[PDB]
Enzyme design. Structure first.
Site, mmCIF file in Angstrom:
data_model
loop_
_atom_site.group_PDB
_atom_site.id
_atom_site.type_symbol
_atom_site.label_atom_id
_atom_site.label_comp_id
_atom_site.label_asym_id
_atom_site.label_seq_id
_atom_site.Cartn_x
_atom_site.Cartn_y
_atom_site.Cartn_z
ATOM 1 C CG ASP A 1 -1.987 0.906 1.090
ATOM 2 O OD1 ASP A 1 -2.179 1.558 0.157
ATOM 3 O OD2 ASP A 1 -2.570 1.146 2.253
ATOM 4 C CB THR B 1 -6.379 1.595 -0.615
ATOM 5 O OG1 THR B 1 -5.303 2.512 -0.189
ATOM 6 C CG2 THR B 1 -5.911 0.181 -0.278
ATOM 7 C CG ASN C 1 -10.706 4.432 0.123
ATOM 8 O OD1 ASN C 1 -10.380 3.224 -0.693
ATOM 9 N ND2 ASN C 1 -9.484 4.757 0.084
ATOM 10 C CG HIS D 1 -3.366 7.896 -1.637
ATOM 11 N ND1 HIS D 1 -4.286 7.196 -2.032
ATOM 12 C CD2 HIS D 1 -2.984 7.691 -0.379
ATOM 13 C CE1 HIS D 1 -4.673 6.465 -0.760
ATOM 14 N NE2 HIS D 1 -3.782 6.678 0.132
ATOM 15 C CG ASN E 1 -24.848 5.384 -23.293
ATOM 16 O OD1 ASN E 1 -23.751 5.682 -23.917
ATOM 17 N ND2 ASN E 1 -25.281 4.307 -23.634
ATOM 18 C CG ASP F 1 -21.841 3.234 -23.025
ATOM 19 O OD1 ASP F 1 -21.159 3.764 -23.687
ATOM 20 O OD2 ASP F 1 -22.552 1.979 -23.276
ATOM 21 C CG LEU G 1 -18.665 0.659 -24.484
ATOM 22 C CD1 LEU G 1 -19.982 -0.571 -24.117
ATOM 23 C CD2 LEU G 1 -17.549 -0.196 -24.875
ATOM 24 C CG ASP H 1 -23.673 6.935 -28.112
ATOM 25 O OD1 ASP H 1 -23.390 6.249 -27.284
ATOM 26 O OD2 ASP H 1 -24.111 8.052 -28.057
HETATM 27 C C1 LIG Z 1 -14.947 -2.941 -19.359
HETATM 28 O O1 LIG Z 1 -15.144 -4.454 -19.256
HETATM 29 C C2 LIG Z 1 -16.240 -4.847 -18.797
HETATM 30 C C3 LIG Z 1 -16.600 -6.555 -18.879
HETATM 31 O O2 LIG Z 1 -16.478 -6.865 -20.230
HETATM 32 C C4 LIG Z 1 -17.566 -4.090 -19.953
HETATM 33 O O3 LIG Z 1 -18.924 -4.070 -19.040
HETATM 34 C C5 LIG Z 1 -19.744 -5.183 -19.787
HETATM 35 O O4 LIG Z 1 -20.172 -4.447 -20.712
HETATM 36 C C6 LIG Z 1 -21.554 -4.499 -21.444
HETATM 37 C C7 LIG Z 1 -22.470 -3.558 -22.082
HETATM 38 O O5 LIG Z 1 -22.494 -2.346 -21.076
HETATM 39 C C8 LIG Z 1 -22.489 -5.437 -20.251
HETATM 40 O O6 LIG Z 1 -23.466 -6.364 -21.163
HETATM 41 C C9 LIG Z 1 -24.794 -6.250 -20.616
HETATM 42 O O7 LIG Z 1 -24.990 -7.457 -19.587
HETATM 43 C C10 LIG Z 1 -26.129 -7.363 -19.014
HETATM 44 C C11 LIG Z 1 -26.241 -8.544 -17.907
HETATM 45 O O8 LIG Z 1 -25.632 -7.940 -16.866
HETATM 46 C C12 LIG Z 1 -25.436 -8.591 -15.524
HETATM 47 O O9 LIG Z 1 -24.642 -9.982 -15.901
HETATM 48 C C13 LIG Z 1 -23.220 -9.750 -15.895
HETATM 49 C C14 LIG Z 1 -22.569 -11.115 -16.089
HETATM 50 O O10 LIG Z 1 -22.391 -11.680 -14.894
HETATM 51 C C15 LIG Z 1 -22.653 -8.869 -14.749
HETATM 52 O O11 LIG Z 1 -21.123 -8.957 -14.805
HETATM 53 C C16 LIG Z 1 -23.250 -7.575 -14.702
HETATM 54 O O12 LIG Z 1 -22.608 -6.963 -13.654
HETATM 55 C C17 LIG Z 1 -23.041 -5.537 -13.561
HETATM 56 O O13 LIG Z 1 -23.968 -4.966 -12.806
HETATM 57 C C18 LIG Z 1 -23.971 -5.386 -11.163
HETATM 58 C C19 LIG Z 1 -25.048 -4.807 -10.620
HETATM 59 O O14 LIG Z 1 -26.317 -5.052 -11.170
HETATM 60 C C20 LIG Z 1 -22.632 -4.961 -10.694
HETATM 61 O O15 LIG Z 1 -22.397 -5.671 -9.495
HETATM 62 C C21 LIG Z 1 -21.417 -5.138 -11.581
HETATM 63 O O16 LIG Z 1 -20.344 -4.352 -11.144
HETATM 64 C C22 LIG Z 1 -21.573 -4.573 -12.853
HETATM 65 O O17 LIG Z 1 -22.029 -3.140 -12.964
HETATM 66 C C23 LIG Z 1 -21.734 -2.399 -13.972
HETATM 67 O O18 LIG Z 1 -22.214 -2.934 -15.405
HETATM 68 C C24 LIG Z 1 -23.651 -2.549 -15.498
HETATM 69 C C25 LIG Z 1 -24.199 -3.161 -17.036
HETATM 70 O O19 LIG Z 1 -24.368 -4.485 -16.731
HETATM 71 C C26 LIG Z 1 -23.775 -0.970 -15.226
HETATM 72 O O20 LIG Z 1 -25.239 -0.738 -15.131
HETATM 73 C C27 LIG Z 1 -23.297 -0.450 -13.954
HETATM 74 O O21 LIG Z 1 -22.968 0.987 -13.855
HETATM 75 C C28 LIG Z 1 -21.995 -0.811 -13.676
HETATM 76 O O22 LIG Z 1 -20.829 -0.261 -14.730
HETATM 77 C C29 LIG Z 1 -24.811 -7.667 -14.370
HETATM 78 O O23 LIG Z 1 -25.093 -8.594 -13.004
HETATM 79 C C30 LIG Z 1 -27.323 -7.599 -20.122
HETATM 80 O O24 LIG Z 1 -28.431 -7.745 -19.439
HETATM 81 C C31 LIG Z 1 -27.253 -6.561 -21.103
HETATM 82 O O25 LIG Z 1 -28.265 -6.538 -22.276
HETATM 83 C C32 LIG Z 1 -29.187 -5.545 -22.374
HETATM 84 O O26 LIG Z 1 -28.688 -4.781 -23.754
HETATM 85 C C33 LIG Z 1 -28.536 -5.320 -24.936
HETATM 86 C C34 LIG Z 1 -28.118 -4.810 -26.143
HETATM 87 O O27 LIG Z 1 -27.361 -5.702 -26.873
HETATM 88 C C35 LIG Z 1 -30.107 -5.794 -25.351
HETATM 89 O O28 LIG Z 1 -30.326 -6.485 -26.533
HETATM 90 C C36 LIG Z 1 -31.028 -6.267 -24.319
HETATM 91 O O29 LIG Z 1 -32.162 -6.360 -24.748
HETATM 92 C C37 LIG Z 1 -30.578 -5.772 -22.999
HETATM 93 O O30 LIG Z 1 -31.739 -4.690 -22.564
HETATM 94 C C38 LIG Z 1 -32.668 -4.868 -21.675
HETATM 95 O O31 LIG Z 1 -32.451 -4.032 -20.420
HETATM 96 C C39 LIG Z 1 -32.040 -2.537 -20.489
HETATM 97 C C40 LIG Z 1 -31.554 -1.995 -19.161
HETATM 98 O O32 LIG Z 1 -32.410 -2.405 -18.090
HETATM 99 C C41 LIG Z 1 -33.324 -1.931 -20.945
HETATM 100 O O33 LIG Z 1 -33.316 -0.477 -21.336
HETATM 101 C C42 LIG Z 1 -34.093 -2.726 -22.315
HETATM 102 O O34 LIG Z 1 -35.126 -2.128 -22.827
HETATM 103 C C43 LIG Z 1 -34.130 -4.224 -22.146
HETATM 104 O O35 LIG Z 1 -34.900 -4.794 -21.331
HETATM 105 C C44 LIG Z 1 -26.099 -6.418 -21.705
HETATM 106 O O36 LIG Z 1 -25.391 -7.427 -22.396
HETATM 107 C C45 LIG Z 1 -21.923 -6.196 -19.177
HETATM 108 O O37 LIG Z 1 -22.809 -6.587 -17.937
HETATM 109 C C46 LIG Z 1 -20.463 -5.367 -18.584
HETATM 110 N N1 LIG Z 1 -20.001 -6.146 -17.666
HETATM 111 C C47 LIG Z 1 -19.408 -5.492 -16.281
HETATM 112 C C48 LIG Z 1 -18.963 -6.649 -15.390
HETATM 113 O O38 LIG Z 1 -19.538 -4.168 -16.212
HETATM 114 C C49 LIG Z 1 -17.141 -2.743 -20.057
HETATM 115 O O39 LIG Z 1 -17.984 -2.068 -21.466
HETATM 116 C C50 LIG Z 1 -15.824 -2.270 -20.477
HETATM 117 N N2 LIG Z 1 -15.465 -0.926 -20.704
HETATM 118 C C51 LIG Z 1 -15.094 -0.360 -21.745
HETATM 119 C C52 LIG Z 1 -14.961 1.163 -21.708
HETATM 120 O O40 LIG Z 1 -14.549 -1.055 -22.735
HETATM 121 CA CA LIG Z 2 -3.536 2.162 -0.637
HETATM 122 CA CA LIG Z 3 -22.231 5.043 -25.801
HETATM 123 CL CL LIG Z 4 -13.524 8.223 -2.163
HETATM 124 ZN ZN LIG Z 5 -3.425 6.012 1.822
#
Ligand SMILES: *[C@@H]1O[C@H](CO)[C@@H](O[C@@H]2O[C@H](CO)[C@@H](O[C@@H]3O[C@H](CO[C@H]4O[C@H](CO)[C@@H](O)[C@H](O[C@H]5O[C@H](CO)[C@@H](O)[C@H](O)[C@@H]5O[C@H]5O[C@H](CO)[C@@H](O)[C@H](O)[C@@H]5O)[C@@H]4O)[C@@H](O)[C@H](O[C@H]4O[C@H](CO)[C@@H](O)[C@H](O)[C@@H]4O[C@H]4O[C@H](CO)[C@@H](O)[C@H](O)[C@@H]4O)[C@@H]3O)[C@H](O)[C@H]2NC(C)=O)[C@H](O)[C@H]1NC(C)=O
Ligand SMILES: [Ca+2]
Ligand SMILES: [Ca+2]
Ligand SMILES: [Cl-]
Ligand SMILES: [Zn+2]
Ligand SMILES: Cc1nnn(Cc2cc(C(F)(F)F)ccc2CCC(=O)N2CCC(Cc3ccc(S(N)(=O)=O)cc3)CC2)n1
Ligand SMILES: [K+]
Ligand code: NA
Length: 805
Positions: free
Chosen positions: A121, A159, A180, A420, A685, A687, A689, A691
């Protein structure tokens, strides 16, 4: 409830955690207030300390002792780490010469080299050189193994976000640990450093390395350690696990030190009190290596020495107070310190307005030491927006400073001299990476890289398939002797059309004009060849970018530039051109100031129109290939085609024109030519990625012309600057940016001055990786070079940071 009347007999530092109300004996039981009554007596023995002495050698085993020096200790796996040195005439590991580890030299029954992660750390990158005289074990790992001069952490440089990024390969916005301290409005729950809410698994997204291993049949040590377990006992515990039978023994482990962070906060990064904590960490490394040597594992295990973030000089007197800016200071909640995050104190207050808070915090004092942002306007390289736990209003704090709400928060809580959390490009926040073992290279230095890349490599080291993450798998292959990951280039999804001349001038009714009606068989065949791609090898140096999604687009060739023109978005996805060191800059002639020309290769229905820009009182236009860099007066007419036009706010045109008129030529002079690829980005949005069409929130008034959120450029040349960009035989050099497309220049406090005093500073803040642009556009660059694919992956992750040495 816990029934603490159970016992830890035969269960000390057990690997499978047990369920309440049964009492626990694992390395986190203390943190949960759940240990069995006899855990201290049985599991935290301290008698006689941590080192053998001459008089203890061959002793009769006494089970009360912290560690052992009896003849049976090697078979029990519990000798003091210096046993063979004191009692059997052996050398300490640090005193042995380094010798290349060409193959793993492992005891029978080991299926794969184990991985031990030694995490520290607050270990600032410059400690490796500045402290090298007092860290001989660490210096040996560094010089004999593979090392980077530094490793870049993730933002914020705190951290919990960084340890969990190391474990998952995810940005904080995706893993969910965004500071944190956090408030989740869907849960209505608060996460803190202290207390129990942080143990709830709902905070922690993605898939960490210990879970990835367990799911694929590779056993893991428990990575976490309660603060009261002393370091000597953490090391002894790892070494004892390494003596388990084959079917019970883990293959992956972690050690964690709270130092040097703990002392760094009190004394500052280079306080004279910092030497001792560095000495003590080095001693701990020595204990591990001597212990591995006793087990005949010192040429079998892969060891990673890695930090989470660095440490900067920060004192109480360098604090900015929001009470000196806001009238309404009690209507907000601030997350304070080395970043700021602002939200309403009450969701029932309808007189809360973010626009007025932002305006009261913008450029208000001449030396102001923080800058406010709506989170979507933060530099894209931070990847800090797509999570409901990140507040809409963010403060980027200058290095060496804090922000607080009111003075009373700072004296009713100077103590501290270090902190930091700042922007992850700041030199003081950089941390360390060393890899040592059979799978790492020997005596190898590698360029700086980002901590998001390490999860993939740790998976490679253990033969695991990584869960989906933000690393670029293959970009760190140059760290490894073996176990490299050999990716293939993604397949192109959409092939282009190659349109010829298909429309007459009178078919267009775009409201555009140009003074171009000015008239040769020599020069006519020539211009025809340019429109069919005869100069394309000069301007497209690394092949055309590949389109990785389904769409309709055309390739358009010209004397000075080539483009991929989207029929759906009505503008180029990309525009490519090369500017030699010798190129000349010219003006836009008087007669061509408002010239826009129909492109006879592209239908009226798939073109922009000038009338929309006239009627839209907020929006103007610019060009992707700059008319200033035309190769001749005749070629300059190509630059005014309607197919090279893009929508631009007048405030942004100031930035863009200075980039195109002054900076491109400056870079060609400095770098011996440059290749430029420019284009629009749409990320409404936030994200990170590309649009789709149905996500676009703004259009040029009365039209279907979408407005970009950002404009990018990728600027490539020869790393050996003695060769020109367009005749380069070896590795490449790149810098890139993703500029926000804003209707004001409020971000730049000095914008009323000449562009030479503020534009380049803006561009440096918005520096980017090629890979960032790939995510934002669905394009894949550098498809046709003479270079290996892994080398190109490393190039795509490079970030030009503009910090000094
Ligand atoms: C960095 O790398 C990561 C990992 O590869 C990239 O993130 C991925 O990007 C994908 C697109 O954004 C995304 O894919 C979606 O998955 C949905 C299922 O998600 C769940 O399952 C996975 C797998 O186990 C899990 O990892 C997810 O975890 C997230 O959410 C939980 C809380 O619920 C958190 O604990 C966790 O931290 C994580 O949160 C983060 O991601 C979510 C999005 O999933 C954000 O909202 C958070 O802010 C946070 O950043 C989940 O448990 C799946 O359902 C999606 O499908 C929808 O979209 C497709 C489009 O193709 C559509 O066809 C479908 O109809 C569907 O839409 C429906 O739902 C909509 C919303 O409710 C609605 O409006 C519509 O009308 C429909 O009903 C989609 O495939 C993937 O989950 C994440 N994974 C992670 C780990 O983040 C990331 O992009 C990379 N970054 C860069 C810059 O490159
Ligand atoms: Ca630290
Ligand atoms: Ca976007
Ligand atoms: Cl913080
Ligand atoms: Zn510290
Ligand atoms: C955060 C975080 N994210 N991932 N890790 C594990 C880690 C990772 C990595 C790696 F290899 F990636 F470099 C190396 C080392 C560790 C262990 C860190 C550790 O020992 N510390 C003491 C307990 C403390 C409070 C706490 C206690 C318990 C829990 S919980 N919710 O899991 O019970 C959380 C935080 C967290 C720090 N820590
Ligand atoms: K206009
Ligand atoms: Na300004």
């Amino acid at each position: 409830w816990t029934a603490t009347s159970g016992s830890c007999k035969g269960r000390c530092f057990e690997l499978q955690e047990v369920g309440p109300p049964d009492c626990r004996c694992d390395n986190l039981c203390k943190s949960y207030s759940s240990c069995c009554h006899d855990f201290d007596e049985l599991c935290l023995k301290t008698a006689r300390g941590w080192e053998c002495t001459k008089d203890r050698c061959g002793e009769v085993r006494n089970e009360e002792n912290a560690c052992h020096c009896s003849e049976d200790c090697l078979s029990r796996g519990d000798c003091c780490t210096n046993y063979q040195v004191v009692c059997k005439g052996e050398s300490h590991w640090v005193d042995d010469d380094c010798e290349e580890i060409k193959v793993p030299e492992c005891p029978a029954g080991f299926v794969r080299p184990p991985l031990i992660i030694f995490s520290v750390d607050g270990f600032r990158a410059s400690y490796m050189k500045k402290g090298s005289k007092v860290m001989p074990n660490i210096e040996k790992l560094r010089s004999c193994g593979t090392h980077a001069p530094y490793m870049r952490p993730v933002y914020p440089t705190k951290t919990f976000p960084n340890l969990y990024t190391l474990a998952t390969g995810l940005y904080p916005e995706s893993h969910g640990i965004v500071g944190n301290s956090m408030y989740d409005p869907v849960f209505d729950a608060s996460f803190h450093l202290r207390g129990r809410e942080k143990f709830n698994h709902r905070w922690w997204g993605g898939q960490p390395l210990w879970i990835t291993a367990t799911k694929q049949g590779v056993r893991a040590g428990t990575f976490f350690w309660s603060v009261s377990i002393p370091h000597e006992r953490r090391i002894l515990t790892i070494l004892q696990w390494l003596s388990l039978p084959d079917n019970e023994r883990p293959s992956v482990y972690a050690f964690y030190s709270e130092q040097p962070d703990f002392s760094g906060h009190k004394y500052g990064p280079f306080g004279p009190e910092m030497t001792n904590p560095l000495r003590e960490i080095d001693k701990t490394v020595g204990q591990l290596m001597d212990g591995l040597k006793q087990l005949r594992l010192h040429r079998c295990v892969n060891v990673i020495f890695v930090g989470d973030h660095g440490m900067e000089d920060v004192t109480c007197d360098r604090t900015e107070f929001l009470s000196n800016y806001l009238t309404n200071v009690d209507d907000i909640t601030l997350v304070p310190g080395t970043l700021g995050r602002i939200r309403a104190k009450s969701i029932n207050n309808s007189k809360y307005d973010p626009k007025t808070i932002i305006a009261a915090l913008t450029c208000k004092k001449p030396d102001q030491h923080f800058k406010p942002y709506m989170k979507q306007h933060l530099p894209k390289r931070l990847h800090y927006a797509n999570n409901r736990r990140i507040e809409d209003i963010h403060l980027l704090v200058d290095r060496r400073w804090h922000v607080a709400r009111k003075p009373l928060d700072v004296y009713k809580k100077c103590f501290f001299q270090g902190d930091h959390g700042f922007d992850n490009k700041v030199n003081s926040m950089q941390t360390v990476f060393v890899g040592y073992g059979p799978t790492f290279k020997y005596r190898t230095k590698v360029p700086p890289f980002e901590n998001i890349e390490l999860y993939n490599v740790m998976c490679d080291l253990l033969g695991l398939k990584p869960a989906p993450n933000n690393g670029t798998h293959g970009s760190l292959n140059h760290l490894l002797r073996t176990n490299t990951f050999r990716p293939t280039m993604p397949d192109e999804v959409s092939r282009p059309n190659y349109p010829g001349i298909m429309y007459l001038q009178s078919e267009f009714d775009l409201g555009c004009t140009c003074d171009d009606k000015v008239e040769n068989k020599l020069e006519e065949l020539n211009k025809r060849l340019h429109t069919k791609g005869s100069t394309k090898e000069r301007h497209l140096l690394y092949g055309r970018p590949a389109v990785l999604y389904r769409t309709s687009y055309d390739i358009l060739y010209h004397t000075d530039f080539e483009s991929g023109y989207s029929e759906i978005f009505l503008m180029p996805l990309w525009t490519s051109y090369t500017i030699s060191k010798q190129a000349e800059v010219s003006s836009i002639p008087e007669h061509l100031t408002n010239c826009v020309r129909p492109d006879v290769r592209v239908s009226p229905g798939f073109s922009q129109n000038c009338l929309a820009y006239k009627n839209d009182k907020q929006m103007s236009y610019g060009f992707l290939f700059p008319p200033y860099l035309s190769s001749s007066p005749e070629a300059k007419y190509d630059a005014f085609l309607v197919t090279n036009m893009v929508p631009m706010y007048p405030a942004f045109k100031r930035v863009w024109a200075y980039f195109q008129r002054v900076l491109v030529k400056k870079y060609a002079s400095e770098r011996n030519g440059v290749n430029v690829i420019s284009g629009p980005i749409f990320d409404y949005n936030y994200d990170g990625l590309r649009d789709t069409e149905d996500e676009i929130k703004q259009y040029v008034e009365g039209s279907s012309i979408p407005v970009p959120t950002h404009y990018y450029s990728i600027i490539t040349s020869c790393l050996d600057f003695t060769q020109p960009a367009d005749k380069c035989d070896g590795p490449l050099s790149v810098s890139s940016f993703i500029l926000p497309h804003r209707p004001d220049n409020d971000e730049s406090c000095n914008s009323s001055e000449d562009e030479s005093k503020w534009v380049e500073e803006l561009m440096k803040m918005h520096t980017a990786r090629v890979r960032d642009i790939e995510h934002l556009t669905g394009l894949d660059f550098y498809r046709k070079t003479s270079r290996s694919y892994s080398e190109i992956l490393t190039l795509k992750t490079y970030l030009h940071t503009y910090e000094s040495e």
